[PDB]
Design a binder for this molecule. Structure first.
Ligand SMILES: Nc1nc2c(ncn2[C@@H]2O[C@H](COP(=O)(O)O)[C@@H](O)[C@H]2O)c(=O)[nH]1
Ligand SMILES: Nc1nc2c(ncn2[C@@H]2O[C@H](COP(=O)(O)O)[C@@H](O)[C@H]2O)c(=O)[nH]1
Lengths: 201, 201
């Protein structure tokens, strides 16, 4: 009952989306924020599952309205975290996972100090290229551009609280579980959850 | 290869010693500091296993010599953490567990800032009395005195980073594992352990 935000960032092709989806299956009382994006809906994508897919007009509206807790521009497209959904989850006592880039992370850290951030590292640059190329949904020409953006994303790893290497899926998931589980044992969180016990003693 | 100190504190009778012993069996690269004490050696106690049992003359000597990283007086007896052994472990890249009281914790926090501290709570005051009474090695008259010292120890829980309830042994051990495991995934620790990978990228 002292819910927190858990920021997860990684270069494209690091396997972050899959890790986060397994994480929420393994843990209770934690949900993934579904972002809004102007990035074109790809074959395979599902509205309300991968993203809320909208156009620039809609997204710009939300920005001016202040509907986003956080928003950024990435590869000439827009992504943002709808503010109200997140706050409803926190109110309900559920932790929230934010799969956002380094720019969004900076915003969240300012706005919600207790937030913890985790950076997912690939075991090699070649691992990124491999995973990205195998996504037939993606253009195989923007690769050299996406990999360039990946190295720049990774240069920001120093801004994060934890680093986790995705070299073995199960182990990486287990490490994410350690990090969230430990947060939930912090004195600040426990003062609330153990209110009755601490009262007795 | 960025080893840390993990302080474990709890009122007498909370089952801390047993938890810590199971913890070191479950994790690698972590060792328990064996303290020096003037507290009389009890039936069942083993030299170099439970404590290094010495007399006041020896202990006072160590204090004046500065042989202790940390030392305190508890129930009119002396306990301390020999400094050199701990530093050797850290140098070797091994984390160190310190089973010390709240006074010792304050000293360690000053002396070694990265240190994390965990307070073990009993599920009830009656749990302490039960566990203590069942220790036939202990005098059953000092109980009301030890329980008084337990409530005063527990009032210091606010000085600790994490709170863990020992209501189920396996679960409490698993929570200790989360806490140490998460520390080892911190960016500061990972900058060292992942030096080669970060170099490649
Ligand atoms: N700041 C921010 N970044 C996001 C958000 N959603 C996705 N991203 C970032 O945008 C990148 C592009 O994701 P993609 O277009 O590959 O699905 C992600 O890897 C992530 O770093 C968001 O809501 N806010
Ligand atoms: N400060 C400090 N406290 C210790 C040390 N060793 C044991 N203690 C504290 O002294 C208490 C008494 O332990 P006992 O006499 O029951 O074995 C422990 O519960 C612990 O809080 C030590 O090396 N330093």
């Amino acid at each position: 009952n002292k819910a927190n935000l858990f920021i997860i960032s990684a270069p494209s092709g690091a396997g972050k989306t899959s890790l986060v989806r397994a994480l929420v299956k393994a843990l209770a009382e934690i949900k993934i924020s579904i972002s809004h994006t102007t990035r074109p809906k790809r074959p395979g994508d599902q509205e309300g599952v991968d993203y809320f897919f909208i156009d620039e007009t809609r997204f710009q509206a939300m920005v001016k309205e202040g509907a986003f807790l956080e928003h950024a521009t990435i590869y000439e497209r827009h992504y943002g975290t709808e503010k109200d959904w997140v706050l409803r989850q926190l109110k309900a006592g559920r932790d929230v996972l934010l799969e956002i880039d380094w720019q969004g992370a900076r915003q969240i850290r300012e706005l919600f100090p207790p937030a913890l951030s985790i950076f997912i590292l690939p075991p090699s640059i070649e691992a990124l290229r491999e995973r990205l190329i195998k996504r037939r949904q993606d253009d195989t020409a923007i690769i050299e551009q996406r990999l360039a953006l990946a190295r720049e994303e990774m240069a920001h790893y120093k801004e994060f609280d934890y680093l986790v290497v995705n070299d073995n899926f199960d182990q990486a998931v287990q490490n994410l579980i350690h990090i969230i589980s430990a947060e939930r044992l912090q004195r600040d969180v426990q003062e609330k959850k153990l209110s009755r016990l601490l009262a007795e003693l």
